[PDB]
Design a protein around this ligand. Sequence first.
Ligand code: CLA
Ligand code: CLA
Ligand code: CLA
Ligand code: CLA
Ligand SMILES: CCCCCCCCCCCCCCCC(=O)OC[C@H](CO[C@@H]1O[C@H](CS(=O)(=O)O)[C@@H](O)[C@H](O)[C@H]1O)OC(=O)CCCCCCCCCCCCCCC
Ligand SMILES: CCCCCCCCCCCCCCCC(=O)OC[C@H](COP(=O)(O)OC[C@@H](O)CO)OC(=O)CCCCCCCCCCCCCCC
Ligand code: HEC
Ligand SMILES: CCCCCCCCCCCCO[C@@H]1O[C@H](CO)[C@@H](O[C@H]2O[C@H](CO)[C@@H](O)[C@H](O)[C@H]2O)[C@H](O)[C@H]1O
Ligand SMILES: CCCCCCCS[C@@H]1O[C@H](CO)[C@@H](O)[C@H](O)[C@H]1O
Ligand SMILES: CCCCCCCS[C@@H]1O[C@H](CO)[C@@H](O)[C@H](O)[C@H]1O
Ligand SMILES: CCCCCCCS[C@@H]1O[C@H](CO)[C@@H](O)[C@H](O)[C@H]1O
Ligand SMILES: O=C1C=C(Cl)C(=O)C(Cl)=C1
Ligand SMILES: O=C1C=C(Cl)C(=O)C(Cl)=C1
Ligand code: OEX
Ligand SMILES: [Ca+2]
Ligand SMILES: [Cl-]
Ligand SMILES: [Cl-]
Lengths: 51, 32, 50, 30, 97, 37, 33, 34, 334, 137, 243
Amino acid sequence: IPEKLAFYDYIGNNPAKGGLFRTGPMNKGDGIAQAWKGHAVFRNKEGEELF
Amino acid sequence: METLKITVYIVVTFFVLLFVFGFLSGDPARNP
Amino acid sequence: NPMWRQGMFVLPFMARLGVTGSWSGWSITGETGIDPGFWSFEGVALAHIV
Amino acid sequence: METITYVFIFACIIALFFFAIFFREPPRIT
Amino acid sequence: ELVNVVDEKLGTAYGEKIDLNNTNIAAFIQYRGLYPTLAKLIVKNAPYESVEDVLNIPGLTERQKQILRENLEHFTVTEVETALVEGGDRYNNGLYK
Amino acid sequence: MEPNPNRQPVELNRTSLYLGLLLILVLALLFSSYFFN
Amino acid sequence: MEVNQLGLIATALFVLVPSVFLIILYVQTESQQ
Amino acid sequence: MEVNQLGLIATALFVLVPSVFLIILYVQTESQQK
Amino acid sequence: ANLWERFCNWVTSTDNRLYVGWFGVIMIPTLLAATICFVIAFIAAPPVDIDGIREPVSGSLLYGNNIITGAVVPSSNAIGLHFYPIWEAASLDEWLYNGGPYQLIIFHFLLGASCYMGRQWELSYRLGMRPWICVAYSAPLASAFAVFLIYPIGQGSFSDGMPLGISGTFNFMIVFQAEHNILMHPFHQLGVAGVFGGALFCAMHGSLVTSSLIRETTETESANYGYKFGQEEETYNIVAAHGYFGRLIFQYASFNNSRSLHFFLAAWPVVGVWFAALGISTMAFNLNGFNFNHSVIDAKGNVINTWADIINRANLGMEVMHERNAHNFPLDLA
Amino acid sequence: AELTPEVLTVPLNSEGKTITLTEKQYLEGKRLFQYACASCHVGGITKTNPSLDLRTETLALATPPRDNIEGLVDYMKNPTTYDGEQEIAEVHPSLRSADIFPKMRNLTEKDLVAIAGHILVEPKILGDKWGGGKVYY
Amino acid sequence: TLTYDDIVGTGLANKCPTLDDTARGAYPIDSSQTYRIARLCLQPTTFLVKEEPKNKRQEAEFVPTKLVTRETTSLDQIQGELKVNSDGSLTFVEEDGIDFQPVTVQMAGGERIPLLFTVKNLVASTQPNVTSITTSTDFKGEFNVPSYRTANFLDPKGRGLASGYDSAIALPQAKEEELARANVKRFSLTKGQISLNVAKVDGRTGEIAGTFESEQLSDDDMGAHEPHEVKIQGVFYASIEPA
Ligand code: CLA
Ligand code: CLA
Ligand code: CLA
Ligand code: CLA
Ligand SMILES: CCCCCCCCCCCCCCCC(=O)OC[C@H](CO[C@@H]1O[C@H](CS(=O)(=O)O)[C@@H](O)[C@H](O)[C@H]1O)OC(=O)CCCCCCCCCCCCCCC
Ligand SMILES: CCCCCCCCCCCCCCCC(=O)OC[C@H](COP(=O)(O)OC[C@@H](O)CO)OC(=O)CCCCCCCCCCCCCCC
Ligand code: HEC
Ligand SMILES: CCCCCCCCCCCCO[C@@H]1O[C@H](CO)[C@@H](O[C@H]2O[C@H](CO)[C@@H](O)[C@H](O)[C@H]2O)[C@H](O)[C@H]1O
Ligand SMILES: CCCCCCCS[C@@H]1O[C@H](CO)[C@@H](O)[C@H](O)[C@H]1O
Ligand SMILES: CCCCCCCS[C@@H]1O[C@H](CO)[C@@H](O)[C@H](O)[C@H]1O
Ligand SMILES: CCCCCCCS[C@@H]1O[C@H](CO)[C@@H](O)[C@H](O)[C@H]1O
Ligand SMILES: O=C1C=C(Cl)C(=O)C(Cl)=C1
Ligand SMILES: O=C1C=C(Cl)C(=O)C(Cl)=C1
Ligand code: OEX
Ligand SMILES: [Ca+2]
Ligand SMILES: [Cl-]
Ligand SMILES: [Cl-]
């Protein structure tokens, strides 16, 4: 999966998440993105995948 | 760079000629 | 870290219509060592000032 | 912000030159 | 972790004697008969495992070996330090008067 | 240069000054918290 | 409090620029004959 | 560059306060009856 | 009429708000080129390897300078006196690294400023004036030639020309003192007498004329309203001014003749600044200030220091520190 | 302080014989040192080789010893490297090379002695300033 | 035949000698004679700098650069022993010469990369059984890359390794730990590698020429920042002589 595709699937790039007086670039909020950590898969003790 | 050089050479030559011909065009007689 | 993460407002309008390179050698698609000619981002800015 | 401040003040000075020369109060003989 | 290796070298015998592996060549002027002929040979044939190895420089005359023996008390050897021997600095270290 | 006949004097009376300063100062008192954030 | 540093200059110009505009207009009104 | 943050407001008021003082005096001079 | 005649009449017209003239045909493009390059460089130019040792010095505002530290940095010592136009560089990137803008600016400036001087002659001729205002201007102009052209020629490099910046000027002055003892040079001393004296006589003349304005105004209005532009009568009583000045010093110390007075006002600073320019232009060939280092010796031979020896100690501190990575051999011979 | 006979007494040879210079000799030596030597040795240093100076302790450790009149006079006739291994008249002014160093052509034995006495006396006056360079100016 | 006055200012002085397109011969090696390189010349034509990416999963690439220090880049007058090894390979052992050039190249966007382009102390060997040098002969070897500045170099605040201040004297009471990397100068010494591909051989004259690729680290500013990897490509010339 391209990092660029994964990065679009992230709410910090959603333009409906801002604030009227939270000024400047998006990088000023969550930071300057460096790398995809990879896809997180959660599981319980029974081994079922959870979402 | 070659084009810049030729351009500047043309520009400079133009103004220097204006200067030389200007002072030849009866400059002593251009006084009050 | 594309332009829209960086608070860039006029850069995308230059890019939208074909100005994608800098005189310093970069392009917004991540290329290096491009010759944009006069109509780089800097040339656009200078033309508007003049 | 400091570069903007320096260039702004400089630019205001050049504009003042333009008004001081071309929009001066004209000298009038009396 | 960050250490000035030249200041560190001053805490070894390099700070007390002529180090045959590191010291700039003008230091050999401090003693009779060493400069410039032996001084050149010493720097050219460095480094030395021990001071007495300086006696084994090929081509030394019998008198030269004798003079070196008289001055071993003024010599030392330490590990070669890159910062003191690069740049040709053993022949000219940028210090004059 | 011939005088422009379209020129007009401009006026602001003292009440308008007080009203304007009130508007400005109260807008500042209101918006300053959001500028400091 | 970690306030925005530009808040001070923003507030100062917000007050001063329109206030001086009104003062300029008021004073030149008073000085008219 | 780590400049003093008050440098900006200091410079801005330094320019604006005396400039506006002069502009007030000039404009009300022009508006006096001629 | 033909167009060459109409254009030539426009060029030499005494009715243009700013006089153009034939010197102006050269002055205007060269000063515009110099001015535009200077402003762009002062704001945005990258660091420049002034001393040719791959140690680039930052001059521009965007690369960390303020108004006081910023400069257009002189061209590289590796260039020396070689002509370095833009089209000599492989790229603008190379040109900027090596100090190209500096050469572009100073050569256009010096040409434009020399034409400024001719333009002053030209308009005075067209207006029917006497001609020598341009001679007064030759003093600052000569000084600019000294620090931007002559001194580099003598030393072999435009990297030793005066930098185009406030702190860079001070660097030039301090290195100059280390290498030439300019304070101890009589031509610089004449320079100081010129500008100290020029400032003194400026204040003096201003105060004496102002002291003797004829009363034409009331107590509230500015006294300047007492003079109308173009009036035939002189606006002050020079007999009263000199009756004051002759008693301040003694009777004969005064310039009673306004023409002699105003000639002196022109001549004193202009002559002093001529010598200042000649100081720089001759120290350019290393004929340096007086050297009295160890001049005073006691009966045994001990050196007895004077204030000259203290100056020498300060000069030494400048000398050993300047361009700290540039010298490999013991003598700084240029 | 004065330039006394004691100050003007300098070693003649390596065996400890001294010689007492006249004030005239010292002045002549200083003049001749300026005439023929100071362009490289001003103040006791050596501009073309700063590693070697004219300090008396440096001269004492040269080979053969140069910290005396005869040693210095021999040097001005036939100069050598500091270790005595090589004769350097071809690049150092000397009576032996006066054809190529013409300022040596008219030096008498007395002149060489006077120059030597200057080199030995000056550190007795100036101390560490002689051969110290600009640090000591 | 050219003289200095034919050449000065043309840029030719920064170019290595070349061999004709007819130079496709073979230089015989006699295993009982000793050999030397009388002259080795390396002329760089391309400087590439490896980009440093934020995520280490993507493989970094070498990008083009712009040379800003003019025609000052070539190594020349390099000489050294040319050994015949028992397996028939040849080993060049560099002894002396103009074997380094400081070079500054600029990346897109303006970042300047200084490096000490060098083959100091090169030892480079061919394949086994080189009975003659041909256009199939190659040299591979390693060399040393010492600090771009040497030990006396003083930074703009007067700090250095073998000279200079040992602290930031303009900040007399600041805490020292945060400034240690800038205050404490360190002398780098690293390895580079080079390949020489012989493309032309004049069998009669002992001259050869070809292309090279070398990799080495750039200036680390006496330990102040991490260096970059640089790849240098160009042409080379060498003359071989009986010694
Ligand atoms: C069409 C207008 C427009 C838009 C959409 C943008 C958009 C952007 N700007 Mg640009 N900019 C603009 C015009 C614009 N700009 C102009 C005209 C200037 C010169 C001042 C600038 C100078 C500028 C700078 C210097 C910077 C930006 C930056 C940005 C980015 C962040 C914006 C932000 O934080 O806003 C915050 C918005 C607000 C806090 C809203 C203000 C609402 C006001 C105060 C309300 C006033 C009410 C009024 C008094 C009521 C009167 C009532 C009365 C009638 C009674 C964003 C992409 C930033 C960036 O990231 O650059 C890379 C940045 O540093 N812009
Ligand atoms: C001389 C010609 C010229 C050219 C080639 C450019 C080019 C550019 N401009 Mg500049 N500009 C110019 C003059 C020019 N400008 C002038 C005179 C002004 C002052 C008004 C500006 C002010 C300006 C601003 C404020 C901005 C630019 C920007 C730009 C860039 C983006 C263009 C864009 O998106 O516009 C989009 C244009 C339109 C969407 C046109 C809308 C037209 C409406 C719909 C017309 C309706 C009227 C019509 C009569 C209806 C009937 C039509 C009929 C055919 C049926 C581009 C490099 C942008 C930029 O990147 O800045 C750095 C930007 O923000 N320009
Ligand atoms: C009055 C107009 C004028 C003048 C006199 C100059 C002069 C100069 N320019 Mg500038 N320039 C100008 C306008 C001018 N410029 C304009 C409008 C632009 C924007 C296009 C530029 C952009 C520009 C750039 C980008 C550069 C220059 C550079 C230069 C310098 C070298 C030029 C050269 O080598 O030509 C040489 C010309 C010739 C050899 C032929 C000239 C023909 C005459 C007849 C030759 C005989 C004249 C003789 C020597 C003296 C006659 C004097 C008279 C009294 C008789 C020189 C200082 C370069 C520079 O500054 O390098 C440091 C440089 O890089 N100029
Ligand atoms: C009280 C102490 C003192 C005083 C009074 C002086 C006085 C002077 N010094 Mg000295 N100096 C001093 C201490 C002092 N110095 C010390 C301590 C040092 C060692 C650190 C020096 C080392 C020193 C050096 C190295 C130099 C001086 C020079 C001078 C002269 C400088 C003024 C000048 O050049 O006018 C001349 C006028 C000009 C240079 C102006 C040229 C203007 C051009 C033609 C036009 C400019 C137009 C501009 C760009 C745009 C205008 C804007 C507008 C159009 C909008 C002046 C005589 C300088 C000198 O003699 O120059 C020849 C010089 O180079 N001094
Ligand atoms: C940056 C400045 C240059 C711009 C560069 C790009 C060129 C833009 C295109 C041309 C625009 C022209 C605008 C000029 C307006 C003007 O000045 O008019 C003033 C008058 C009015 O024109 C008069 O105009 C009359 C007709 S009318 O008024 O136009 O209708 C006419 O009859 C009369 O003869 C004529 O003199 O023109 C003149 O006085 C003669 C020309 C003077 C030119 C001076 C340039 C000086 C530069 C020197 C270097 C300074 C360095 C920087 C210092 C900060
Ligand atoms: C980026 C460039 C920025 C440029 C700077 C622009 C500066 C311009 C600022 C304009 C300010 C104008 C102010 C005019 C103020 C003013 O002049 O008012 C008085 C004015 C009276 O007008 P008249 O027609 O009587 O004319 C009299 C003349 O002397 C006026 O010029 O009425 C208006 O202007 C209509 C607007 C109503 C204004 C409402 C006042 C609000 C009451 C108080 C509200 C606060 C308290 C609320 C408590 C909850
Ligand atoms: C420059 C051209 C010189 C002039 C003129 C003179 N000397 Fe010199 N001197 C010079 C050099 C380069 C050296 C070192 C040579 C070497 O390789 O050893 C010297 C050395 C001396 C010495 C020996 C110093 C010592 O042993 O410590 C002496 C005594 C000396 N020089 C004396 C001397 C005299 C008397 C001169 C004028 C007559 C003179 N020198 C001229 C360079 C130059
Ligand atoms: C940083 C903030 C800056 C904000 C700047 C705001 C600037 C405002 C400029 C206002 C200009 C006022 O414009 C001014 O108007 C007055 C009338 O009103 C004119 O005055 C004119 O009319 C009056 C009244 O009939 C006559 O007495 C007078 O003789 C005549 O000249 C002035 O000639 C003009 O200078
Ligand atoms: C305001 C100064 C104008 C400077 C002009 C520089 C022209 S530069 C020129 O521009 C062309 C684009 O039109 C390119 O195709 C070309 O590669 C480039 O060399
Ligand atoms: C007001 C004068 C400003 C002049 C600036 C003109 C830049 S011109 C610009 O330069 C780039 C860098 O090499 C090139 O890539 C490009 O081809 C060229 O057009
Ligand atoms: C008309 C004014 C244009 C002035 C700017 C010209 C330089 S262009 C400038 O160069 C920098 C360093 O190379 C880059 O970091 C930057 O992205 C680029 O915009
Ligand atoms: O003697 C004088 C000197 C000066 Cl500086 C004057 O201004 C006057 Cl008015 C008379
Ligand atoms: O002695 C003088 C000193 C100076 Cl600065 C002068 O200008 C004149 Cl004119 C005579
Ligand atoms: O460049 Mn500027 O200053 Ca005239 O001396 Mn040499 O060179 Mn560098 O040192 Mn000192
Ligand atoms: Ca091959
Ligand atoms: Cl300096
Ligand atoms: Cl040097």
